[PDB]
RNA sequence: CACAUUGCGCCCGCCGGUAUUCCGGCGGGCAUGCCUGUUCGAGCGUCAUUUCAACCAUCAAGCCCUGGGCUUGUGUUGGGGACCCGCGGCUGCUCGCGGGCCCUGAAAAGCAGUGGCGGGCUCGCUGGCGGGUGCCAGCCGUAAAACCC
């Protein structure tokens, strides 16, 4: 009727399924507004972009001089000679 | 109510039942899993596997980010370890199925695009550096999202492995992962144009090359013989740089 | 003195409801397939009083906030009449945690183990020197009478209202 | 000076014996229903 | 044996201890309602010998009734109306 | 200006001058302090004397810490009345009572060489001591030569 | 207010520290370690409040001044002697490759002009070091793990690791990695 | 809820009408006192909270005549008693180091003495040099060194 005693060491030692098992299509309700996907990356974002996308030395210093949340885009295209010289993105977590 | 009973027990000197009540609490710092089961929430939020596949983009971006971030109070260390495991398990599925299609190098990181059952999945993985956390950043909000995504990916991984035929979860070698196997600590057992680009080829990755991105790209697109310096981790086909049977060596040095 | 008392008292705490079941299960399993007398803190007002009357309690600790005070008002005199060292502890709830209850009106120690015989003896001397000598004169005196500034003004005003005429 | 010395001596005595740990209208608080 | 000490104490109702406790408790009951629940007997020895046990199902309600007469005298007692 | 003198005893091992100064300087100001010790060994005799510059501080501190149970020692804080306070009481006060290895010093002094000319006349004094011991051995009935 | 028990407690603590330091001095090289040149990770933990002068200087040289501080040290004869002195205040053992990789990446920092600069790019790796041939963060990991000629330069560059109290988690061998896993 | 009019509120769900918002209907619920328990609280009602713990070698190292033995691993509360000694100073009395006998709760009421080295403080002379210190939780034993940097 009841379990026998076991030492605490043995108790510590002793101690998956398909979610869509019964799945059928359902009609989409009209009250749902799905969030749009973030746009895919372009040619400005590559670490070795074509030289045209690169900005001028003046157009850069104006960009960092301007405070954030006032810029058209949150980045400026930059060219790096190697993957070794590509630094970490400072706004990744943000 | 349970937290109140733990506090009373802790504040009264009886630590034995306080530990007993803790086991009922299912704390993430000990289990490493989400505190509340979200099986029914995920099912009603994604009524079919197709809806789950369409929103894997944000799920993978979170989990690959937190697999590189330090351990916080909202998301403890054992929670991050499960994020590595799920992301590594997911990467193995694309390698076997050759579902990886595109990859892109950007100033924001590395972009991977895959095609699972006809849905395009795009996610961004940060470069392998010391990610910075400054300003007003709240990990409790992100902890809630991590909790949901880990449960979602775990169920997605199970179905994808079952569709192929492999058993889930894959066997994990703690000793090999300790040595630095990373993706190489998984063994995939059964249950009882893509795969030609680098098939009959052999690569050696130098120290200054990103091991995790390169190995994923090569192994998904056909390669079976990849080696690297022993500092990169256990699992290389060969370690000696003087091995004669090495066609390509990837370098990033002046 | 409270901390030193509870340091000895904690080492003789009675087993909890979970611990007692585990010990009972251990012995039952062993027999299915000879002990020394337990030493523990005695609690319960009827229990402790009988121990005092039979001169078995070495040390008695009494709570200071029993809601009907007449339940413990005789205890210090009874302890003194029998020659039992006693002390008054702030908190019946603090005594409760010692015996795994919500509240203990009184706790007692009859006999301790050999490794704590010297510790208990030192605490007996500490209480009777540190506490019983300090109250040898104040236990016979009436308490209260802590009139503040407002109370003193009222009393002086009352006197001056009867200085001239006393209506009776 | 003498008052300052007496206050310091009393403060140490209190700590030695007792330790160092020591709108307007009231409404019925909203509780769980 | 605490209840035997309580029995003797309740016999001396004019003693300094009992008179003091009865004075303060009388004021406290007067600030409360005429009929209100008492969480605990104020005379545990008296309640015990009258049949009170500390089980779930036993309650104490204390009540104050105006004393005096109706020159007519009520044949029942003030305790009966309480 | 009425300095007060405290007599503390039954001290635990470790409640030495620096701790006696540190703890009681919290009550007030300390002028001189001495913990009694042994010359033969650098060990305390578990009592000490503390002089406060303020008499009222010595009264408050002695009342509070009188029967204090510390590491199994019930302390003793008694104020010595200014009458029988010895004029020579704080003499090694505020000075470290360092331990001298008298056994090492006296013992090795027996090793250092020196002209034994006075030692040989001491040998004669040893002989006369032996003669006295020989008298003490007459009742014993013991004979011993050189 | 500081209590009389704490004064006596600290003295008896200092008396025992003076004892073990004297014994460690007289039988120098007490630890029976075979002559090997490998890597050990050292973590500063809570302990005796009043550190004796000799251990105080050792913790200063190793930069283990604050609690939850970690450093990489080669096991030389002097270092093993130094670590034996600071045994009460440190938790130490041999790391594994994953432990070294996680620490230098997730919590990696560097000292540039006496300032704590995070390891966000290899540009500063090859600007401070690099004349020794260390141009990327992986080279720094390689030199730390497979301890080489310029371990000292790699070590001083690495700012002491500021770890975090584990959330429910002597020579510890590989069990220092379990402590690191929780404390990271 | 309402002299009860087949009228009107609040919560959960459903049905039919162009219906996520409108209308109507339907189903399940919403009185008071009290008891037991649950959960959520209030109180210038009372209390605890700056942790008196454990942590030498539960065996190591070296040897010898090969299996037993040997050596090294310095680790002790204080006080008292016309008691019996050994050895050093004291012209001597006596005093020191170490024993044997006896007592005492982790017991207690000035009886402070042995020369230095380095450091701190302080005072003089030309950062340096030369003297003092009841200051050293730093060492040594009478020189001095070490630590220190």
TrEMBL record, chain C:
Domain Ribosomal protein eL8/eL30/eS12/Gadd45, residue spans: 33-120
- GO CC, alphabetical: cytosolic large ribosomal subunit
Q: Which UniProt keywords apply?
A: Ribonucleoprotein, Ribosomal protein
| Domain of life from the UniProt record | Eukaryota
Which biological process, per GO, is one annotated for this protein?
ribosome biogenesis
Q: Which residues form the signal peptide?
A: none
* One Gene Ontology MF term: RNA binding
Family that this chain belongs to? Belongs to the eukaryotic ribosomal protein eL8 family.
What job does the chain carry out? Answer: Component of the ribosome.
Name of the featured protein? 60S ribosomal protein L8
Please give the range of the full-length protein represented by this chain. 89 to 262 of 262
Automatic annotation (TrEMBL), chain D:
Q: Which family does it belong to?
A: Belongs to the universal ribosomal protein uL23 family.
Ribosomal protein as a keyword of this entry, yes or no, is yes
Q: Which residues of the intact protein are shown?
A: 12 to 52 of 156
GO MF annotation: an example: rRNA binding
**UniProt keyword terms in alphabetical order:** Ribonucleoprotein, Ribosomal protein, RNA-binding, rRNA-binding
Q: Where is the composition biased (Low complexity)?
A: 1-19
The organism of origin for this protein: Chaetomium thermophilum (strain DSM 1495 / CBS 144.50 / IMI 039719)
What biological-process GO terms show up in the record?
Answer: translation
Mind telling me which GO cellular component terms the entry cites? ribonucleoprotein complex; ribosome
What's the protein called, per UniProt?
60S ribosomal protein L25-like protein
Instruction: Indicate yes or no for the key word Oxidoreductase.
Output: no
UniProtKB/TrEMBL annotation, chain E:
Q: Which GO terms describe its cellular component?
A: cytosolic large ribosomal subunit
Q: What keywords does the record list, in alphabetical order?
A: Metal-binding, Ribonucleoprotein, Ribosomal protein
Entry's Gene Ontology molecular function annotations: RNA binding; structural constituent of ribosome
GO BP annotations of the record are: cytoplasmic translation
Report the domain of life of the source organism: Eukaryota
Write out the similarity annotation. Belongs to the eukaryotic ribosomal protein eL15 family.
Question: What is the official name of this protein in its record?
Answer: Ribosomal protein L15
- Higher taxonomy: Eukaryota, Fungi, Dikarya, Ascomycota, Pezizomycotina
Range covered out of full length: 2 to 102 of 203
Automatic annotation (TrEMBL), chain F:
Q: TM spans, by residue?
A: none
Residues covered by the RRM domain:
4-82
Q: Which compartments is it annotated to reside in?
A: Nucleus, Nucleolus
What is the name of this protein? Putative RNA-binding protein
**Which organism's genome codes for this protein?**
Chaetomium thermophilum (strain DSM 1495 / CBS 144.50 / IMI 039719) (Thermochaetoides thermophila)
